[PDB]
Each structure stands twice: as C-alpha cells, then as structure tokens.
C-alpha cells in the first residue's frame, strides 16, 4: 500500500463551449482524484492571468474529504455572460478563448494545465426568426403607422423565443430589422411581410 | 298667427382633428314651441361634407322647442385623415350655414357656422415618460430603445394605439400620429447617462 499520494488529480473538460454575447452560459468541469479530495483549482492562461472578468465558478465543496470520487466527481459549475460588446472578427475562427485548467489535491499534488476553449458568437447565431402572419396595407411602398405597429407586432407574435430586449423596426416598404441586443441583426423581406390589401 | 322664423345657436369653437370623431349640437327655438325641420348647407348649396351626419330625432313634435327646452340637433363625423392642410390656418375650415323652419313655415335666414380641423398633433400633448437611464447618451442600445418606448407609451394612454413610437440614436423621441402629423419629445425629457 503506497505510502503517499503522488499522483495529481485528473480533470474532465467540456468539448464544446458555445456561448452567445449578453446572454448567460455555463459549463461544468468534472475533477476526480484518487484521494477522493480536490482542494481547488486555477483558471489561467497557461499560467498566466486569465485576462476573463466576466467568467465565475463556485467554490461550494471545495476542499472536502470525499468531494472528488470516481463515482462522485467535483463538479465545478462554471458560468457568466460574454459582454454584449465583446469584438468578433472578420474571421468568426477567432471569436474564442482557449485557457488552461489545473486542480490541487489535499497532498500538494497539482495537475498539469489542460486546455478548454470558450466560443463566442453574435446573437443572430442563436436566433432564427420565423415569418409573420402577412400584414395587409393601403400601399405597398409607404406603409402607415398602424401598419408597421401591425408588423412589429406579427413579427414579435411569431417569434417568442427571440429576446424581449431585441428591437424590432419596420421601414417605409414594411422591410423588417431584428437587432438583438448586442446590435447583431436578422433582416426579414419586405414580401414576406406585406401585401397590398386591394389585392388580396 | 306664427310670423316669426325660429332662431339657432351655433357652437362657437368647432375643432375637429383629422381622423378622429367630434360631435356638436345645433340649439334650436321658436315661439310655437315647435320646429319642423333644419337644412345644412353652403349658404344655400350642396353641404359637399358626406362625412358629416345629423340627427332628426324629434323633429316636428310639439313643444320640441321651447325657451325651456329648445331642440338640441346632434351632429357628428370624422374629417379625412388625409385632408390637406392650408399653410394659413384661418383657412384650414369649412364654412357652413344652417336653417330652419316652424310648422307654420316660417323659414330663418342662413346662419353660419364654422368647422375648424387640425392635425392630430394638435390634439396631442404627450406626457413626461419615466427616465430611461443609458450607457451611452450619444448611442442607445436596442434595450434601451425598447424601454425608451415602452416608457413613452406607458405615461401616455391617451395617444392612438395605432401612433407609431420610434427613438434615435441619441434618445429623441418621434411619435407619428395616423394622420402622419409628428411630435417630438427632446433627449433630456426623456433619457439619463
Ligand atoms: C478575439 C481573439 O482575438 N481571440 C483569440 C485569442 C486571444 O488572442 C486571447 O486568448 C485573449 O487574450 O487567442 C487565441 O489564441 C491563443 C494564442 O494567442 C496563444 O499564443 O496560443 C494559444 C494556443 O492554444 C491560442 O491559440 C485563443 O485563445 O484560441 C486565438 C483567438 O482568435
Ligand atoms: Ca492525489
Ligand atoms: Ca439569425
Ligand atoms: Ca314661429
Ligand atoms: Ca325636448
Ligand atoms: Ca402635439
Ligand atoms: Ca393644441
Ligand atoms: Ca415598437
């Protein structure tokens, strides 16, 4: 029977990270050690400042005789929100962060740095907006003002799942604009709109 | 023997806004105590205002008339909401006359009458909306749009539902009423840093 525990405890990361600007994820990490006790951990940048203000995990059962088995992990819930305002490239590729995790056990022993990678994307990524019920006007070209509330509202009652904080306009041709809240945008048609009402 | 013609009295201050329902009344009196019948007219023309309606409702009754209780004639319509507007308001009216009559026939001379329309924004006054508090006073978020709207229509149930609500970059307000007449309500009315 060994006298000492040498060996680090093991981390299990999430493959795939997916977060979208001004809305709240979270992940979890799963750490287990063959003391059965994790002490705690370090998010970095290989080594260096994480450089992530916005990024937050629990330290609930941290450094707890048995919170680190193989049959019950430390699972470590990692959460926050990406700022709206946060730059995405020309090459959408770049629009991630890779850092590096690393556990302690009670003994010392510390794992070597593991990656995982947080992917960022606009909110447009996330959203894709069903067509309004057709809203029928006097002119085609020059909608009115109850015309394009009409709109709006059609719009907003055939998207529920699409953000109460995303801005709906309507041009003069009954051209449609989404702008979720981080700016990002979905454009709807103005022919899967409206339709002149004479006509039909 | 009934000689004398009944006599009228025309409201003073008819003010219609252009898509919106009004309602005045014509006052009518005659020493018989009885009218028979009114005519609207262009001093004696065609009235050429088809939106505009009234009610007979106790026309040639008697005593439907008296000193005491004259004939009080309803009248009613909607101006179109796409009617023009002369640069020079003493013009944007219609000048109109009325007449009536006793059962005995004596008819009263055309007495005028004067209906003035305006734009909605001239009815309209839009109320103080809760301050929005921005990030960016010289860019509004789409939230704060949305919450900027939101307040206007909020303080503001009077206003058309159909009045479309839209908010600048900077947080000014437009509000454009049916008729397509405008208010404005400035920044600092309405948005704080
Ligand atoms: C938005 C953006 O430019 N994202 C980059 C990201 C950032 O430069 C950085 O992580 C935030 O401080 O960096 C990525 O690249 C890393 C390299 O900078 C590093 O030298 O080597 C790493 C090797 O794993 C990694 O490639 C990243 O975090 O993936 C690239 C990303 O577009
Ligand atoms: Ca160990
Ligand atoms: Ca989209
Ligand atoms: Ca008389
Ligand atoms: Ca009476
Ligand atoms: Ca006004
Ligand atoms: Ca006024
Ligand atoms: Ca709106």
Redesign the interface.
Known sequence: RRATDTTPPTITVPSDIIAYRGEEFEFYFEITDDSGQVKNIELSTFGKPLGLNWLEYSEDNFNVPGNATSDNPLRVRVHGTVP?NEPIPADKNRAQFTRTIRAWDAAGNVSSNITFVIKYRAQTDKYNPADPTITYVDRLSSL???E??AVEAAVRAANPQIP????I?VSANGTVTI???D?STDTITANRVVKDLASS
């Open positions: 709206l009115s003002p109850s394009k509330n109460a904080a995303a801005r306009t702008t979720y809240p700016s």
